[PDB]
Amino acid sequence: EQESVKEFLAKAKEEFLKKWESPSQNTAQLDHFDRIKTLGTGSFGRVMLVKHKETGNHYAMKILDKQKVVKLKQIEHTLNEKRILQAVNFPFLVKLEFSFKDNSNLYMVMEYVPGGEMFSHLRRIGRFSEPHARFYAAQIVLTFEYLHSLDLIYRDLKPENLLIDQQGYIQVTDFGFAKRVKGRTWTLCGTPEYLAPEIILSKGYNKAVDWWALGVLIYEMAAGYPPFFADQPIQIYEKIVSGKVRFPSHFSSDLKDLLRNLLQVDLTKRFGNLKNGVNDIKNHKWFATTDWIAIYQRKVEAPFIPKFKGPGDTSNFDDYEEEEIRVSINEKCGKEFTEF
Ligand SMILES: N[C@H]1CO[C@H]2[C@@H]1OC[C@H]2OC(=O)Nc1ccccc1
Ligand SMILES: N[C@H]1CO[C@H]2[C@@H]1OC[C@H]2OC(=O)Nc1ccccc1
Numbered sequence: 001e002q003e004s005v006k007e008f009l010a011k012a013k014e015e016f017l018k019k020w021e022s023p024s025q026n027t028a029q030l031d032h033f034d035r036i037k038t039l040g041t042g043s044f045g046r047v048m049l050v051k052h053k054e055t056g057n058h059y060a061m062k063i064l065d066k067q068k069v070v071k072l073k074q075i076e077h078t079l080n081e082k083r084i085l086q087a088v089n090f091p092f093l094v095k096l097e098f099s100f101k102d103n104s105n106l107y108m109v110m111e112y113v114p115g116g117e118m119f120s121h122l123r124r125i126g127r128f129s130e131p132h133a134r135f136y137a138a139q140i141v142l143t144f145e146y147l148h149s150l151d152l153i154y155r156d157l158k159p160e161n162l163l164i165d166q167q168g169y170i171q172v173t174d175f176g177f178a179k180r181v182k183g184r185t186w187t188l189c190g191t192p193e194y195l196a197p198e199i200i201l202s203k204g205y206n207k208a209v210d211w212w213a214l215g216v217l218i219y220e221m222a223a224g225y226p227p228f229f230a231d232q233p234i235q236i237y238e239k240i241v242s243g244k245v246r247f248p249s250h251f252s253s254d255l256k257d258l259l260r261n262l263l264q265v266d267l268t269k270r271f272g273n274l275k276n277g278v279n280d281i282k283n284h285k286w287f288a289t290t291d292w293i294a295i296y297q298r299k300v301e302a303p304f305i306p307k308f309k310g311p312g313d314t315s316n317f318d319d320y321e322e323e324e325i326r327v328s329i330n331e332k333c334g335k336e337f338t339e340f
Contacts, residue, residue, distance in 0.1 A: 001279065009149045012090075016150050019087035020180075025340070028098035028109060030327070033061065036312070038320040044068035046323075049112060049314060058312050059097060060113070060173075063325060064106040066333040074176075075336050077189070081175045082108055082340060090146045091298060092139045094163070094171045101340050103328045113171045115306030116316030119159035127224035130252060131289075132303040136162070137218050138287065138295045139170045144214070145278045148207045153181050157213040158194050159220065168302025181206070192233045193226045197265050200237045211272030211281075215262030222255060223248050227263065241265065254286040 033050040036058075040047045045064035052059065069078050085096040085108065098109035118136070122128065128136075140157070147154055155177040163171045177189045184204035196212035198205040220226040227246075228239040243265040247256050261271040261280075271280045282292060294300050306316055 009146070012146060013150055015089065016087050020083065023083050023339075024086050024099070026100050028100055028107075030100075030102065030107065030325070033059070033109075035325065037314050037317075038322055039314070039317045041320055044072050044074060046320075048325075049312070050109070051312070058112045060094075060110045062108040062110065064108075066101075066104060066106060066337060069106070070333055070336060077176060077179075078106060079337075079339060080177075080179050082106070084152060084178050084180070085110075085175050088147075088150070088152075090143060091296065092143045092170050092172055094173045099340070101337060103331045104326060106337065106340055110173065111171070112311070113163035113165050113173070114308045114311060114313050114316060115164035115166065115168075117160050118162040118164055118170070120316065120318075121164065121304065121306070122159055122221065122224070128221045129303075130222060130255060130286075133218060133221035134287065134290065135295075135300070135303055136170055136221060137214070138290050138292065140172075140214055140217065141278065141281055141287075142292070142296055143170075143172060144207075144210050144272075147178075148210070148278075151180050151182055152178055153185065153207050154178050154210050155190055156194075157210060157217055158191050159217065164304075164306050166306075166308075167298065168305045169298060192236045193228060195237075195240065196267070197241045197243065198267055200240060205267070206273075208267045208270050208273035211262055211270055212264075214272075215259055218255075218262070219245075219247075219259055222251065252286070254284075254288075258284050258286045 032054070033052055036049040036051060038046055038048050039060065045062060047060055047062050050059050050061045051057070064078055069075060082099055086099065094113065095111045096108060097111065100107050144154065156174055161172065161174045163173055165171050179185060184206055186202075186204055188199065188202070190199065194213045194216050196205065196209040199209055216226055216228075228236050230236045230239065243263060245259070245263055247259070264270040267273060272278060274280055281287070291300065308316055
């Protein structure tokens, strides 16, 4: 397709490109915030809940150690992440509010989403019913239609990266592997359980890898566990490239048919990567009850609302050792991060 969708995406690309070509920089500093709690950690950064001292607003602050970014070969990826986040705008993406750097670290200050990760709720309940999984899946389909139209690939879809907001809708966080890509790209990155066969085989790959990952996510939401799993990654990779996938008997026939077309090992036959693009997915029988405009407008009542007391409640996140945010007397890796 309808002209309203075509015109929506043309305007979205226009607005993205203006920010992409003139990124914002240096819009706050560390001592504007009080530190509250660590919400998660990793090899080269962590995420902390903070409170802005003048306004009282809460935020999730991602802190990356510049020297560890360089050593783990993530320079280009960290520059991709901040440039993309400062340029996008869509209902189901977390908003970037501030960014800045100092002698030691890079900082990205995001909206705080207090309901926690979809992964926690999935494991507490066991599995989601098909209507519940389908509500979340429709939001990811729309978000990928938006990102792919901007020539972006997301490359890290998994339940840990989908936060649940106060109204029960998804907010996608972590753009650490996202990239603007005209054609193909080649980096090995992602989480093993979610990787498409063409990534594992070191091929040049495209946006079809996000549609494969959506197949893995929908299977995991409806079954309670992902389709390909093992103790060592090499064993996971062998199952993925065979693509041999068994479905629980409680799966509907429509769900199995959709999953066979998303978890298609031949990328030239995979739903989302054919001539009709995303409409092969939106028009599939498993989505026949979905009102796509109502989801986009956030007019559907959600299947589940998280329990929390207020905008600063951390009870839906877990506990980590609290470490210092040190800032060196001397500047580190200045050249490498000039554009940040
Ligand atoms: N979590 C982000 C995204 O929604 C919130 C928040 O940031 C401000 C507000 O932004 C939007 O509602 N964005 C939008 C709306 C319609 C079409 C395209 C983009
Ligand atoms: N989203 C989580 C779960 O899948 C990914 C990711 O974390 C690592 C990996 O974990 C599993 O494959 N879990 C599993 C496998 C079989 C039975 C029960 C659980």
